[PDB]
């Protein structure tokens, strides 16, 4: 009865927040659908215009961001409820191997100087895997020729350091580095989701000067005790 | 053992809400960029081709979306905190301060507030801050829109509490009786807005309705279920 009342109250709060997001999406998509209908009618008729193609593609990009809001929000629930103990080397082995392949295809190099060990972590494996994958792919794009990935552990947590030889980053640019949600280079995700996912696992992220000349991204995650 | 597990639930759900609030704030900020590119494309098209019913329509839809994004940005900046913790509370203790502050506000405005049917010690279960702000918002709206007076009535039965807020204002047209609760509604502050009032009431398994008031203006009805031990 009371355990049941607590479970019902928690779900009721979660569902009402999801209904509000969903209702915000329905309102935004009312003018967007009218706009997409107007565009389609014009495009079907006066069909060869760079401006009309631009309006359609931007309307679709706006629509994808709204879809991201709904998908990524229902998914942040999954990270909260779906958690397990995992070892750092088993968690990120595939990401580091796929990144080494991506580096090779690009004509760049990835060096894992300090490899991960069987260090226990607690959280959502998919979210922690994609957070490192995102920063590593960011280094693969920004780097001139090389990227380096280092793992360190102490009694309290795991430090992941991602370095690149990309252009020197200004302290101002470094301070706002985790602010963009989308990649400026739908749209691919920027580094805001990385900070979000890491803070959700009670860790932190920092942007610093890299010894290789480019950007240094530092992830800290607590050890599972 | 069970406490540690239950507290691990609540704190994980608290971290989830922090990340969902950040996500809403982030995406709200990103929406403007394709919209301005779309508005530039529309402005250019109007120069190249002439006046068009379709182009004029795209333009009025892009402006409506711009207003909604402005409103979504303000909504994303004023998100509520500690929304998870629930407790048993009595209706009179919950809303006493709101009704007293409203009586003072009415006096300052040169208007009158009458609580004809006062709240009793009726048990509710949920978030006090959300339930308090929900009534505060509808009462502060009645104060703002009323011509001279507002009335607040509380009724209880075996299943729930009915709160009726009346004003002698211009009211709300039948066409917008449900529309005023939609995010970003505008006719074209007193609080977080009517969409956030309906969310707070529906999370407590209640409902809100807009009706004709015997006072001539708007009647807002809130229904909330009783907490049953
Ligand atoms: N008591 C009322 N009388 C008349 N109109 C009302 C009343 N309460 C709300 N409304 C209408 O509903 C709209 C949405 O309400 P609300 O979200 O609380 O305020 P806001 O104007 O800040 O968006 C108001 O702008 C107004 O047009
Ligand atoms: Mg108002």
Author numbering:
A (entry chain B): 223 to 407, 416 to 455
B (entry chain A): 220 to 407, 416 to 456
Sentences from the paper on this structure:
Here we report crystal structures of the full cytoplasmic region of CpxA, a prototypical HK involved in Escherichia coli response to envelope stress. The sensor kinase CpxA senses a variety of envelope stresses, including misfolded proteins, and transduces this signal to the RR CpxR through conserved phosphotransfer reactions. The full cytoplasmic region of E. coli CpxA (CpxAHDC), encompassing the HAMP signaling domain (residues 188–237) and the DHp and CA domains of the catalytic core (residues 238–457), has been produced as recombinant protein for structural studies. The CpxAHDC structure consists of a homodimer, in which the HAMP and DHp domains from both subunits assemble into an elongated central coiled-coil region flanked on either side by the two CA domains.
The 3D structures of wild-type CpxAHDC (or the point mutant CpxAHDC_M228V) in complex with nucleotides have been determined in five distinct crystalline environments using either single-wavelength anomalous diffraction (SAD) or molecular replacement methods. In some crystal forms, however, only the C-terminal α2 helix from both monomers could be traced in the electron density maps, because CpxAHDC has a tendency to establish interactions via its central-core helices, leading to the formation of dimers-of-dimers that sterically interfere with the positioning of helix α1. The 3D structure of CpxAHDC is highly asymmetric, not only by a different orientation of the CA domains, but also as a consequence of two potential bending points in the central helix α2. When considering together all CpxAHDC crystal structures, it transpires that the DHp helical bending promotes a strikingly different dynamic behavior of the two CA domains in the homodimer, primarily due to distinct interactions with the central four-helix bundle. Thus, whereas one CA domain (from subunit A) is retained in a fixed—inactive—conformation close to the DHp helices (α2 from subunit B and α3 from subunit A) through a relatively large contact interface (∼1,200 Å2), the other CA domain with apparent unrestrained mobility adopts disparate orientations and displays significantly smaller CA–DHp surface contact areas, the largest of which (∼800 Å2) corresponds to the autophosphorylating Michaelis complex (see below). In all homodimers, the fixed CA domain is sequestered by the DHp domain in an inactive kinase conformation, with the ATP-γP positioned far away from the phosphorylatable His248.
